[PDB]
């Protein structure tokens, strides 16, 4: 008897009375307000304990925002014999759910934005509290994240490959911040890159100083130090990435 009357969910048991209280309907938990019989949605207080329901009234388990920030709405019996879905004390530690990472502070709220934990700087997405992954622009600075940690190196963004550099490489950049790096080679950890006028690493076939190079489309690293098959054709590249004339 689930019907959406005026944008509000009620459940009639087949009774002039719409159900109230905790209801499990088709393996999903709902709470119908005892005054109005409406299915709770969003952050909800029930008997002085805190729960979270999605817009359909389905009780959620995980990390969701209430008026005091992101709380861990935990499986039953995670802390202090909590009932299923109830927000719990969870202090000064990481939380791992599925493939997501959170960090919880002294207030049992998940960190959002930039935070330092054991001398490492992390970024957790303000919208979800989930560890940042992939390319990100924050306060006009470009970063490339993995598991909440800014990565250092050359990675593909929406405008091509950027140099996400160690701190203080250019214009007092922050660790992992993309930097201006124009019309120059970058030699980084046994790999070679060439950066054009827009500070992006070039890819594919290039002629630089009269020498030919091929920069791998997936990494922007020069083919170097051996024979490489490119588009069904074997070429030979010097240790410096310079292509030797001929086919092999």
């Amino acid at each position, epitope marked *: 008897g689930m019907r959406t009357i005026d944008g509000k969910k009620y459940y009639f048991n087949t009774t002039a009375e719409a159900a109230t209280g905790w209801q499990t309907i088709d393996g999903k938990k709902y709470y119908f307000n005892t005054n109005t019989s409406i299915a709770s949605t969003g952050y909800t207080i029930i008997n002085d304990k805190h729960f979270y329901f999605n817009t359909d009234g389905i009780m959620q*388990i*995980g990390v969701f925002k209430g008026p005091d920030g992101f709380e861990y709405f935990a*499986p*039953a*019996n*995670t802390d202090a*014999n909590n009932i299923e879905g109830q927000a719990i004390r969870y202090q000064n*530690r*990481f*939380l*791992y*759910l*599925h*493939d997501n990472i959170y960090y919880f502070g002294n207030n049992s709220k998940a960190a959002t934005g930039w935070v330092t*934990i*054991d001398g*490492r700087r992390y970024y957790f997405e303000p919208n979800t509290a989930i560890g940042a992954n992939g390319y990100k622009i924050i306060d006009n600075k470009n970063f490339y994240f993995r598991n909440g940690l800014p990565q250092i190196g050359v990675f593909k963004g929406p405008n091509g490959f950027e140099y996400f550099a160690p701190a203080n490489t250019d214009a007092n950049n922050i660790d992992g911040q993309a930097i201006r790096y124009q019309n120059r080679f970058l030699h980084l950890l046994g790999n070679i890159y060439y950066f054009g006028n827009n500070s992006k690493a070039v890819t594919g076939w290039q002629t630089i100083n009269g020498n030919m190079y091929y920069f791998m489309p997936d990494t922007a690293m020069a083919a170097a130090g051996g024979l490489f098959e490119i588009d069904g054709v074997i070429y030979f590249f010097g240790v410096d990435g310079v292509k030797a004339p001929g086919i092999y």
Partner: nanobody
Amino acid sequence: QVQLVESGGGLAQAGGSLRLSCAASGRTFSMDPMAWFRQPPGKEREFVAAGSSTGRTTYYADSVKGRFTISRDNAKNTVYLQMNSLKPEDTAVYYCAAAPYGANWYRDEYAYWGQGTQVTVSS
């Protein structure tokens, strides 16, 4: 109330294989990473393997890398350690653990620990 119970341990011979199970009860672990540690004779407990609930993130200690694989059955609240190419040096008390709270899963910072089970690899 919460308990992790290892089973499937005991004797095996070098080059052979064994699968350990760890069944969790008292709460659902279907979102939590689960892991294995081992305490070799006369040595400190050490990390073996850990993995997320989806299996998409897994780590292995250098000593078991390419011989042991971790897997789960979430409906059964259970984690497995498939041990292949067993060596005498794999002899140890094997512990499962769940819901790590440290900066990485190699660190022995886990909300829940099993009872440990003996694995003895001979010859």
